[PDB]
Structures are given as structure tokens and as C-alpha cells.
């Protein structure tokens, strides 16, 4: 399973290489609406549930649902190379995605379907995108090993930053728009100040490669997965590993937190996803 | 005009300058950033601006006294 | 009964003119209509800086704290330290010492620790080559602001070292009638505890806006690494227009803050410098109080300096009224003949002051 989405507390999702957008619940665990799309890698909900936006390594971008028939809209050759990740905004009307034809493009939900409005060129194959939960700024991760932060009312190139010595592959932004978290494949995440871009702790764990970092959206604490079957979570004031979790067996590809209390679900290479909750 | 306008005790300074036409804050005054940037999108108005020893000392002090008298 | 003043308006100029002229001063109703009335912490620490740099000057404050009676002593100067409080950076303390300094007994080697610079007040490089060349034109020879540790807006911790070592007898009189032909447009951009690309994103935008001109543009870059970086991130930009053929300067500066894009900050300081260099004649508008105080403590003769019709506003009015209440010198305002540019020539007869604290 390549990616996980999760709603408030009820429905959950798994995204794989065949297109099995499996729709789950934490109480009966049967995959509700199984269908088939293709080599899908990243995805997101629509904020009321019941509607799922999802990309692919082919040139496409597709949208599905829960209740009615599965395929509703798809845009083929939306990016003529592979795309990597996508995001709704803080409200759920725009749709930003980045793609390794050095393009990041927006979309608008209109009525059932989507509508492209604005392309942006970058000087590198972009491979990650994260938009703030208050639409204050977006951040993009480029393999020429940099992180660029743009605004959203203007997209006027707020902060270009660097320092990871390998392609950074996961970004997150603080819940109250004060601190970003960049994470690369050199086992060293960086908590980054926001007003000018001062690094605070370029700290180091997960001794092969960070694959995805995500933010516990209540306080400013955060979970970080590995590639070597360990998921930790850290606090953002003293920067110590307040918990390790060793309970996978292979490459933990993805994870996602749930916004009710920081209720997290992780997913690995060994076809296992599992649920972590409070004590 | 403007000399007695300054040295008259009664009137306030801004009423003095509007009749003619807070310094702990050091910074000089300024207008709207967008306004003067749009005014000076072209800046050729400022193109008019842009592009022995004892007898020496005696000549220096005597020319000083002469220009002192000539503006006295 | 002797010299009475209202309000904390031009307060540094009132106290520095009292201690230069040697006349006792008394200022009351320092924001007396306020929930926190009286003298603020930065100006009380400023007054005790004056007491550390002079000798025999007694200062008494009322129980209200809004009335200050000041007898002046003699300016001994010397070498001392001074922590400055975080309510106000080092510029607000150094810019009156910059024209109290060159007359004292010993050399001025005084180091200021605290916040380097902020928005409303003067930057260190700003005073360095926007006000040390005008001091070199008025007559001093050896003056320097050794910036040996930068600071920051919210935490500071920086260290400057004002050292002047040209104990001049009195400032020479000034003769400037021509508008200076601006030869070079230079500047620096300083950065503390940030990425170095912020500097390039400043400079390319600023010289992009000023690149449509025949003048030689030259802006330099400095980051501060190690413990010379202060204790908080911050970055600023300053530009001077330097006329080398006689040595005059105009300048403009600003420091970014939370969300300040370096491109638009470079554009803002470039347009602010163009505002100053179009609005000002023969001297900077911010260099103007130093200019008139050196012309008024010049030799017993007249000195003449060009300003334009824009230079005369409320700060200049309260300056000239301050000097007319302190040592009663009318400034004569001639008009220049060519009325294409409505310029006044200020002629000021300097009070015949010499420094009276020199071991000879």
C-alpha cells in the first residue's frame, strides 16, 4: 500500500499499485468500496468524506467516491510525466499537485468535475507538496535538494531553502502555521523556523531513510516513519524521541494522523497497515 | 518670509508649513511604497542630478572674512 | 526660571544642546497625559549614559518622573561600557554621542551591547557611512563604529564599538552651494542567523529596480557566522549614494521582519533612497540635525549650506526653535537665484565655541 487517507474518525483508505482504493472503517475492517484504477501512489479525501482524489505514476489524475458508481472524473495527460503528490487546501476547493515534468499545477472543483487554472514551472523535478492547514503558505520539495515556500494569495516565492544533501521527500507544516518539518533520505529531519527560515534542530534517526513525516495536528508534536520498520514520534519543544515504535517488519511507506486527537494509522511494505491510538 | 515664519513663537510647525505652502523617531518621512515605486518605474527625473603655506593660510582666512562680509 | 521645555519631543537634542552649550535645562510634562507617564526606561538609561560620559553634570527627577532638571558639567568622555536596554537599539544611544563626542578630554572608545537596530531608529552601517563622511566633511579625521558583533531585533546581544580619536578644537565651517553630482551608488546587505540566499534575493531585486541608470551600482553582501550572528535571525539592507568629488552621501536602510520578502524589501529601500535623493539637497534629510548642529557650533563666522524647499518641515522647525531657545541663533534663509529649483541657502553664524577640556 503506497498511501493512506483518513477522515475524522470513521472511514479510512488504502492506496496501492493495482488501484485498490480500499475504503475501510476501524470497527468492522471490511474494505467497503474496492475498485481498480492503476499504479496509484498518493491520494487525499474531500473533507466531508465520500469523495476521494488520487494521482498516479502515469500521466493521469482521477477522482472517485463512496456511494455511487466508482469512476466519476479523470484527467489524462494532466501532467505528461509522473506525478508524485497532491493536496486539497485548508477548505477543500482547490487542488494542488506537483509532478516530475517540473510542473506544479492547480485545479478547482466545479459542478462533479475539476478545472485546471494555473501552472507553475520550477527548475527541477518537483516531488513533494504540502499546503498549510490555514492556507497561509505552500511548500514544495525538489530533488535538486531544496524546499521552496510560496504564498497562496499570490504565490510570490517566499522562501527558498536548502541543506539536506539528498532529495527531501516529505514536508509538513505546523498546525497553527509557525514551524515546518522537512525530511530527506539522509536519516535527518529538520525542524525549521518560519519567519525567516532558521533551522532549529537538524536531528537524526531512522537509520536508513525517512520515508514520510506527519504532524500531530493538535499540539506541535509529530510522527516520523522510517524505511526500516520503525515509527517514532517526537515533541517539538525539547526535540527528544518521546516514543519509538518497532512493530512493523519492512519499509513503512506511509502514515497518516487523524484530526480528532492525533489518532494515527501507518502502512508498510509487508501489506500490513495498523492503528495506533492513545494509552 | 520663512525666517520670521519659523521664529514666530505662536504658530505650530505644521500650521507654519501649511501657511507657507517627535524626533526621537529618527527615520525620515515616507509615502506609500507602491505609490512611489509606481511613480519611479522610470527615474529619469533625477538625471539632472546624476551623471607658499603661510600665504595659503592667510588667503584662506581672508577669503572666509570676505565671504562673511559679503553675505553680511 | 532659566530654561524650560515641554514634552519629550526632540528630547535627545534638548539634552545634548544643554550639555554642549553649558546652560542648565529643565524639561517637564514628559507625556504627562498618559497611563504610564514620565520618563521611559530608554531615556533614563540615556541620561545615565550622559552622566557616565560627562563629569559634574547632576540630574534630578521628580517623584512624578515627568520633570527633569539638568545642570551640565564638562564632557570628559573616555572609555566605558554601556548595556543598552532592549526597549530601544544602539542607534538611539549612539547618534547623540556622535556629535557630543569629538570635544572631550580623552578619546571616545565606548562599546554598546544590546539590540543592533530596528525600524524607527538608526542602523549601525546607516550611521557609519551616512554620518561619518559628513563628520569628515565637518572636520574630524579619525572616527569609526567598529561593529564587532551584530545583534537582532527581538533578542539583540550585539556589540558595537564607537571610537573617535580626533579631538578637534571646533568643527570647521561649511560651504556647500552646489547640488552634489552623485558618482556612485553603493550599499551593504547584512544577514544574521538565516540562509545566505536571502541576501541575493535582496540584492538582485534592488539593483534590478536601480539597474536602469547610468550610475555605477555596487552593493556588497555580508553574512555573520558564529557568535557574531547575534541571538536571533534578522537581516537588513542599506544603500548610500556617495559623491566622491567632494565626499557627500545620502542613504536609506531597512530591516526585514516576519514575512518580509527580500525582493520587495530591496525595492522598498531603493525607492526610499530615490525619495531621499529627490527630496534632499546637498545633505541627507536624516543627516540634517547633525549638519545644522555642526554649523551652529562652527567658528564665529557664517557657514552656508544648500537645502531645498522640501527640507523645511516640522522636524526642521522644531530643530531651529530648539536651537533658538538654547543659544538664540537666527538662521538666515537666502534663496538661490535660479528658481528652477527652489533652494534655500541656510547661513548660520557659529557660536564661538572651543573644546575646553584638553590637556595642553
Swiss-Prot record, chain A:
<comment type="subunit">
    <text>Interacts with snoRNA U3. Interacts with MPP10. Component of the ribosomal small subunit (SSU) processome composed of at least 40 protein subunits and snoRNA U3.</text>
</comment>
<feature type="repeat" description="WD 7">
    <location>
        <begin position="78"/>
        <end position="108"/>
    </location>
</feature>
<feature type="repeat" description="WD 9">
    <location>
        <begin position="205"/>
        <end position="235"/>
    </location>
</feature>
<protein>
    <recommendedName>
        <fullName>U3 small nucleolar RNA-associated protein 12</fullName>
    </recommendedName>
</protein>
<comment type="similarity">
    <text>Belongs to the WD repeat WDR3/UTP12 family.</text>
</comment>
<feature type="repeat" description="WD 6">
    <location>
        <begin position="35"/>
        <end position="65"/>
    </location>
</feature>
<feature type="repeat" description="WD 5">
    <location>
        <begin position="1"/>
        <end position="25"/>
    </location>
</feature>
<comment type="function">
    <text>Involved in nucleolar processing of pre-18S ribosomal RNA.</text>
</comment>
<feature type="repeat" description="WD 10">
    <location>
        <begin position="247"/>
        <end position="277"/>
    </location>
</feature>
<feature type="repeat" description="WD 8">
    <location>
        <begin position="163"/>
        <end position="193"/>
    </location>
</feature>
UniProtKB/Swiss-Prot annotation, chain B:
<comment type="subunit">
    <text>Interacts directly with RCL1 and the U3 snoRNA to form a stable subcomplex. Component of the 90S small subunit processome also known as 90S pre-ribosome that consists of the 35S pre-rRNA, early-associating ribosomal proteins most of which are part of the small ribosomal subunit, the U3 snoRNA and associated proteins.</text>
</comment>
<protein>
    <recommendedName>
        <fullName>Ribosome biogenesis protein BMS1</fullName>
    </recommendedName>
</protein>
<comment type="similarity">
    <text>Belongs to the TRAFAC class translation factor GTPase superfamily. Bms1-like GTPase family. BMS1 subfamily.</text>
</comment>
<comment type="function">
    <text>GTPase required for synthesis of 40S ribosomal subunits and for processing the 35S pre-rRNA at sites A0, A1, and A2. Controls access of pre-ribosomal RNA intermediates to RCL1 during ribosome biogenesis by binding of RCL1 in a GTP-dependent manner and, via its affinity to U3 snoRNA, delivering it to pre-ribosomes. GTP-binding and/or GTP hydrolysis may induce conformational rearrangements within the BMS1-RCL1 complex allowing the interaction of RCL1 with its RNA substrate. Required for RCL1 import into the nucleus.</text>
</comment>
Curated annotation (Swiss-Prot), chain C:
<comment type="similarity">
    <text>Belongs to the RNA 3'-terminal cyclase family. Type 2 subfamily.</text>
</comment>
<dbReference type="GO" id="GO:0042274">
    <property type="term" value="P:ribosomal small subunit biogenesis"/>
</dbReference>
<dbReference type="GO" id="GO:0000472">
    <property type="term" value="P:endonucleolytic cleavage to generate mature 5'-end of SSU-rRNA from (SSU-rRNA, 5.8S rRNA, LSU-rRNA)"/>
</dbReference>
<dbReference type="GO" id="GO:0000480">
    <property type="term" value="P:endonucleolytic cleavage in 5'-ETS of tricistronic rRNA transcript (SSU-rRNA, 5.8S rRNA, LSU-rRNA)"/>
</dbReference>
<dbReference type="GO" id="GO:0030490">
    <property type="term" value="P:maturation of SSU-rRNA"/>
</dbReference>
<keyword id="KW-0690">Ribosome biogenesis</keyword>
<dbReference type="InterPro" id="IPR037136">
    <property type="entry name" value="RNA3'_phos_cyclase_dom_sf"/>
</dbReference>
<dbReference type="Pfam" id="PF05189">
    <property type="entry name" value="RTC_insert"/>
</dbReference>
<comment type="subunit">
    <text>Interacts directly with BMS1 and the U3 snoRNA to form a stable subcomplex. Component of the 90S small subunit processome also known as 90S pre-ribosome that consists of the 35S pre-rRNA, early-associating ribosomal proteins most of which are part of the small ribosomal subunit, the U3 snoRNA and associated proteins.</text>
</comment>
<dbReference type="GO" id="GO:0000447">
    <property type="term" value="P:endonucleolytic cleavage in ITS1 to separate SSU-rRNA from 5.8S rRNA and LSU-rRNA from tricistronic rRNA transcript (SSU-rRNA, 5.8S rRNA, LSU-rRNA)"/>
</dbReference>
<keyword id="KW-0539">Nucleus</keyword>
<dbReference type="GO" id="GO:0005730">
    <property type="term" value="C:nucleolus"/>
</dbReference>
<dbReference type="GO" id="GO:0006364">
    <property type="term" value="P:rRNA processing"/>
</dbReference>
<dbReference type="GO" id="GO:0030686">
    <property type="term" value="C:90S preribosome"/>
</dbReference>
<dbReference type="Pfam" id="PF01137">
    <property type="entry name" value="RTC"/>
</dbReference>
Amino acid at each position: 500500500v503506497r498511501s493512506i487517507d483518513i477522515s475524522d474518525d470513521n472511514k479510512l483508505l488504502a492506496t496501492a499499485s493495482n488501484g485498490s482504493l480500499k475504503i475501510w472503517n476501524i470497527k468492522t475492517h471490511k474494505c467497503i468500496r474496492t475498485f481498480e484504477c492503476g499504479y496509484a501512489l498518493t491520494c487525499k479525501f474531500l473533507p466531508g468524506g465520500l469523495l476521494v482524489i488520487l494521482g498516479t505514476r502515469n500521466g493521469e489524475l482521477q477522482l472517485f467516491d463512496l456511494a455511487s458508481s466508482s469512476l466519476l472524473d479523470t484527467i489524462e495527460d494532466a501532467h505528461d510525466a509522473a506525478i508524485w503528490s497532491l493536496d486539497l487546501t485548508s477548505d477543500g476547493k482547490r487542488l494542488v499537485t506537483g509532478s516530475a515534468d517540473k510542473t506544479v499545477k492547480f485545479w478547482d472543483f466545479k459542478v462533479l468535475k475539476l478545472h485546471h487554472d494555473t501552472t507553475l514551472e520550477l527548475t527541477d523535478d518537483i516531488l513533494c507538496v504540502r499546503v498549510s492547514p490555514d492556507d497561509r503558505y505552500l511548500a514544495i520539495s525538489l530533488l535538486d535538494n531544496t524546499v521552496k515556500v510560496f504564498f497562496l494569495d499570490s504565490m510570490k516565492f517566499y522562501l527558498s531553502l536548502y541543506g539536506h544533501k539528498l532529495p527531501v521527500l516529505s514536508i509538513d507544516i505546523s498546525f497553527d502555521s509557525k514551524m515546518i518539518i522537512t525530511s530527506s533520505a539522509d536519516k535527518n529531519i529538520k525542524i525549521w523556523g518560519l519567519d525567516f527560515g532558521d533551522c532549529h534542530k537538524s536531528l537524526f534517526a531512522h537509520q536508513d531513510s525517512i520515508m514520510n513525516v506527519k504532524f500531530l495536528p493538535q499540539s506541535h508534536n509529530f510522527f516520523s516513519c522510517s524505511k526500516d520498520a520503525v515509527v517514532k514520534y517526537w515533541d517539538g519543544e525539547k526535540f527528544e524521541c518521546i516514543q519509538k515504535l518497532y512493530a512493523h517488519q519492512s519499509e513503512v511507506w506511509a502514515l497518516a494522523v487523524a484530526t480528532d486527537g492525533g489518532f494515527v494509522v501507518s502502512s508498510s511494505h509487508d501489506h500490513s497497515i495498523r492503528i495506533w491510538e492513545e494509552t | 518670509n520663512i525666517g520670521k515664519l519659523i521664529y514666530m513663537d505662536n504658530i505650530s510647525p505644521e500650521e507654519c508649513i501649511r501657511r507657507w505652502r517627535d524626533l526621537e523617531k529618527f527615520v525620515p518621512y515616507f509615502d506609500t511604497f507602491e505609490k512611489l515605486a509606481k511613480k519611479w518605474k522610470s527615474v529619469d527625473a533625477i538625471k539632472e542630478r546624476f551623471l607658499t603655506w603661510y600665504e595659503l593660510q592667510k588667503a584662506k582666512i581672508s577669503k572666509q572674512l570676505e565671504i562673511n562680509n559679503i553675505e553680511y | 526660571k532659566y530654561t524650560t521645555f515641554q514634552g519629550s519631543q526632540n528630547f535627545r537634542l534638548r539634552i545634548v544642546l544643554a550639555t554642549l552649550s553649558g546652560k542648565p535645562i529643565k524639561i517637564e510634562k514628559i507625556r504627562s497625559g498618559d497611563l504610564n507617564p514620565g520618563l521611559k526606561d530608554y531615556e533614563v538609561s540615556f541620561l545615565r549614559l550622559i552622566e557616565s560620559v560627562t563629569n559634574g553634570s547632576v540630574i534630578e527627577i521628580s517623584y512624578t518622573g515627568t520633570t527633569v532638571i539638568y545642570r551640565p558639567g564638562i564632557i570628559v568622555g573616555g572609555a566605558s561600557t554601556h548595556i543598552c536596554p532592549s526597549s530601544k537599539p544602539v542607534g538611539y544611544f549612539v547618534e547623540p554621542m556622535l556629535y557630543l563626542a569629538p570635544f572631550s578630554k580623552k578619546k571616545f572608545s565606548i562599546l554598546f551591547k544590546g539590540i543592533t537596530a530596528s525600524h524607527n531608529d538608526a542602523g549601525i552601517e546607516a550611521i557609519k557611512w551616512g554620518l561619518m563622511p559628513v563628520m569628515e566633511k565637518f572636520g574630524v579625521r579619525e572616527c569609526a563604529l567598529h561593529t564587532l558583533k551584530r545583534g537582532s531585533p527581538p533578542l539583540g546581544g550585539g556589540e558595537v564599538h564607537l571610537v573617535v580619536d580626533s579631538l578637534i578644537a571646533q568643527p570647521i565651517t561649511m560651504h556647500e552651494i552646489d547640488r552634489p553630482i552623485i558618482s556612485s551608488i553603493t550599499g551593504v546587505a547584512y544577514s544574521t542567523r538565516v540562509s545566505p540566499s536571502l541576501v541575493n534575493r535582496m540584492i538582485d531585486g534592488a539593483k534590478k529596480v536601480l539597474k536602469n541608470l547610468q550610475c555605477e551600482v555596487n552593493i556588497t553582501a555580508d553574512v555573520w557566522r558564529g557568535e557574531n550572528s547575534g541571538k536571533s535571525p534578522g537581516w537588513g539592507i542599506t544603500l548610500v549614494a556617495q559623491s566622491k568629488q567632494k565626499g557627500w552621501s545620502y542613504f536609506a536602510e531597512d530591516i526585514g521582519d516576519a514575512g518580509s520578502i527580500p525582493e520587495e524589501l530591496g525595492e522598498k529601500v531603493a525607492c526610499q533612497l530615490l525619495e531621499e535623493i529627490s527630496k534632499s539637497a546637498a545633505v541627507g534629510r536624516n543627516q540634517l540635525p547633525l549638519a545644522i548642529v555642526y554649523m551652529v557650533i562652527g567658528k564665529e563666522d557664517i557657514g552656508r549650506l544648500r537645502i531645498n524647499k522640501e527640507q523645511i518641515d516640522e522636524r526642521f522647525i522644531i530643530l531651529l526653535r530648539d536651537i533658538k531657545k538654547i543659544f538664540n541663533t537666527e538662521v538666515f534663509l537666502k534663496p538661490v537665484d535660479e528658481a528652477d529649483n527652489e533652494d534655500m541657502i541656510a547661513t548660520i553664524k557659529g557660536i564661538g565655541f572651543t573644546n575646553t577640556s584638553k590637556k595642553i
